Design an enzyme around this catalytic site. Structure first.
Site, PDB file in Angstrom:
ATOM      1  N   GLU A  59       0.767  -1.027  -0.105  1.00 24.84           N
ATOM      2  CA  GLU A  59       0.096  -0.057  -0.189  1.00 24.84           C
ATOM      3  C   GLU A  59       0.915   1.128   0.132  1.00 24.84           C
ATOM      4  O   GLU A  59       0.375   2.210  -0.550  1.00 24.84           O
ATOM      5  CB  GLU A  59      -0.799   0.042   1.118  1.00 24.84           C
ATOM      6  CG  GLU A  59      -1.920   0.813   1.085  1.00 24.84           C
ATOM      7  CD  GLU A  59      -2.596   1.403   2.513  1.00 24.84           C
ATOM      8  OE1 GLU A  59      -1.709   2.487   3.060  1.00 24.84           O
ATOM      9  OE2 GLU A  59      -3.515   1.157   3.022  1.00 24.84           O
ATOM     10  N   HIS A  60       1.970   1.295   0.729  1.00 31.30           N
ATOM     11  CA  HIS A  60       2.884   2.220   0.834  1.00 31.30           C
ATOM     12  C   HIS A  60       3.666   2.500  -0.617  1.00 31.30           C
ATOM     13  O   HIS A  60       4.084   3.665  -0.506  1.00 31.30           O
ATOM     14  CB  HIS A  60       3.733   1.848   1.924  1.00 31.30           C
ATOM     15  CG  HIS A  60       3.440   2.546   3.275  1.00 31.30           C
ATOM     16  ND1 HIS A  60       3.829   3.659   3.829  1.00 31.30           N
ATOM     17  CD2 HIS A  60       2.668   1.680   4.192  1.00 31.30           C
ATOM     18  CE1 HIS A  60       3.126   3.676   4.793  1.00 31.30           C
ATOM     19  NE2 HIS A  60       2.537   2.899   5.275  1.00 31.30           N
ATOM     20  N   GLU A 136       4.822   5.183  11.397  1.00 28.75           N
ATOM     21  CA  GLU A 136       3.745   5.158  11.450  1.00 28.75           C
ATOM     22  C   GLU A 136       3.088   4.194  12.457  1.00 28.75           C
ATOM     23  O   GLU A 136       2.146   4.606  13.132  1.00 28.75           O
ATOM     24  CB  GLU A 136       2.789   4.555   9.980  1.00 28.75           C
ATOM     25  CG  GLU A 136       3.286   5.407   8.923  1.00 28.75           C
ATOM     26  CD  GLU A 136       2.554   5.161   7.708  1.00 28.75           C
ATOM     27  OE1 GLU A 136       1.807   4.086   7.634  1.00 28.75           O
ATOM     28  OE2 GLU A 136       2.306   6.306   7.103  1.00 28.75           O
TER      29      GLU A 136
END
Ligand code: BOG
Ligand code: BOG
Lengths: 443, 48
Positions: A59-60, A136
């Site tokens: 996703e990153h 994160e």
């Protein structure tokens, strides 16, 4: 113009399957702007002990550019057309979607397809997003509400695939490889498990055409076009208590096992949570709120907030509640809460459900407030229900629920069941699973 | 000296049987509740 009619008059959701198995769906409105995206049947659940977190690492990088058009270019090309690119990943569902003018519906579709099919995975980018993700995690570690739900799963599905965090282990993120990531994509992102959904001022045909054009990659073997069924996740009545008197408030989540997407009861279950509802110190209704729990919460300063939930999954789910309170009001809060669950099972009123329903109806309708939300509903119903359930239908299913029915279901899922519970913070006053277990029976 | 002799002994019989039955039962119940603690596992996780 009656609600009844306004529902019937809602345009239909077109669904066509390509040859490679991909399904294209969309709801056309008179809107100049739109939202198109691919909703995937992948996620941490589909991961394993060694690649847990890949889907997130992916996703990153999904946006950090593809092979045909690297980072700088990819970014520049999207920004310059005023399109918004967003996406996410949960335990059983991942998705990337774009918000732009209908006019660019096709150029968008192209972009999407280029992202899911040709992610760069530039060796140099990885090592950077690795430091980023690592950051994160530390920020999310300070969000008690998600630290709690994670723990909830961690134990409610302990020892299984569902017991894993979507973001993943620290090690896993420190060592995952260009390979593992590549592998994840090539193993999971596949047509039969994907859905190109869209909503706004788009022509299904213009869409499906642009679809056949960029989503090619045809499969050869039979393995490639059958959707793999996941091994089941076992629920376990248990508790996990992460204590830290240093935190200002305590978080508690309690749940029994849910039925799973396909099951109809889910409707009644939602109708139920509609009764208990939710609270939060900024609701002005205060002591007059209709939700008994909310009232008590107010009458006795029982908590800062609380929410009921019915988190569903393919083959299972979590039906419970969560609340934040001060160290010395945890018990009363919990006590009252479990009380309401008991009320549901033994003494619900027609008056209660009648309202719960209207609250629920308004809810489903609001879930489709814009294009992104609609697209998100289409991308999901297909992926989960295998088709689209129109408000017209939902409403009929909701209108059929009556007290006698809410009772039976809640009883069936809550009464005398061993629950899974997760507590975080200054939880000393909340205590003993045993005691909590007995709050699971007798009004 | 003690006419109750027979009745007293007949009772003793009943007392044992019930006693053995009731004890076993309450042992299981006691264990059953305690299990929650007996197997309980903990760990120390400072932000070290
Ligand atoms: C000997 O036995 C006893 O006889 C009594 C009568 O005499 C009964 O009342 C007792 O129950 C019995 O155990
Ligand atoms: C640990 C609990 C022990 C209680 C055991 C109850 C047994 C007493 O039971 C007695 O047995 C006698 C013999 O027939 C009868 O005559 C009496 O009426 C009866 O009450």
């Amino acid at each position: 113009a009656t609600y009844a009619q306004t529902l019937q008059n809602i345009p239909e959701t077109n669904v066509t399957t390509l040859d490679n198995g991909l399904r294209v769906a969309s709801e056309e409105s008179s809107q100049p702007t739109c939202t198109v995206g691919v909703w995937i049947g992948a996620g941490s659940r589909y991961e394993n002990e060694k690649n847990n977190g890949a889907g997130y690492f992916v996703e990153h990088l999904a946006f950090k550019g593809t092979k045909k058009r690297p980072c700088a270019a990819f970014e520049k090309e999207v920004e310059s057309m005023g399109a918004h690119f967003n996406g996410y990943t949960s335990r059983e569902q991942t998705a990337f979607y774009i918000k732009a003018l209908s006019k660019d519906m096709p150029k968008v579709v192209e972009l999407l397809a280029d992202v899911v099919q040709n992610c760069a995975l530039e060796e140099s980018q990885i090592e950077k997003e690795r430091g980023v993700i690592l950051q994160e995690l530390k920020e999310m570690d300070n969000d008690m509400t998600n630290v709690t739900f994670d723990y909830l799963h961690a134990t409610a599905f302990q020892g299984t695939a569902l017991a894993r965090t979507v973001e993943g282990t620290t090690e896993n993120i420190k060592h995952l490889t260009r390979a593992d990531l590549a592998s994840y994509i090539d193993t999971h992102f596949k047509a039969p498990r994907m859905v190109l959904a869209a909503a706004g001022g788009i022509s299904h045909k213009e869409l499906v055409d642009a679809a056949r054009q960029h989503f090619s990659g045809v499969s050869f073997t039979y393995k490639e076009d059958a959707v793999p069924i996941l091994p089941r996740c076992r629920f376990t009545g248990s508790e996990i208590r992460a204590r830290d008197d240093a935190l200002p408030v305590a978080h508690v989540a309690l749940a029994v096992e849910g039925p799973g997407w396909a099951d109809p009861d889910n409707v009644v279950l939602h109708v139920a949570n509609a009764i208990i509802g939710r609270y939060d110190r900024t609701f002005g209704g205060g002591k007059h709120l209709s939700s008994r729990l909310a009232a008590l919460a107010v009458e006795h300063k029982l908590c800062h907030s609380f929410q009921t939930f019915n988190t569903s999954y393919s083959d299972t789910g979590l039906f419970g509640f969560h609340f934040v309170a001060d160290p010395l009001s945890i018990d009363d809060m919990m006590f009252c809460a479990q009380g309401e669950w008991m009320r549901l099972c033994t003494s619900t009123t027609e008056s209660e459900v009648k309202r719960a329903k209207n609250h629920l109806r308004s809810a489903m309708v609001a879930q489709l407030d814009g294009t992104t939300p609609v697209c998100e509903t289409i991308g999901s119903h297909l992926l989960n229900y295998g088709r689209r359930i129109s408000l017209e239908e939902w409403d009929s299913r909701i209108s059929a629920v009556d007290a006698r029915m809410v009772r039976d279901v809640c009883s069936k899922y809550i009464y005398d069941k061993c629950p899974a519970l997760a507590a975080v913070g200054p939880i000393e006053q909340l205590l003993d699973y045993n005691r909590i277990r007995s709050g699971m029976y007798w009004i | 000296a003690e006419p109750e002799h027979d009745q007293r002994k007949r009772m003793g019989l009943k007392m044992l049987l019930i006693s053995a039955l009731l004890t076993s039962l309450l042992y299981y119940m006691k264990r059953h509740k305690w299990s929650v603690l007996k197997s309980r596992k903990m760990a120390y996780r400072p932000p070290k």
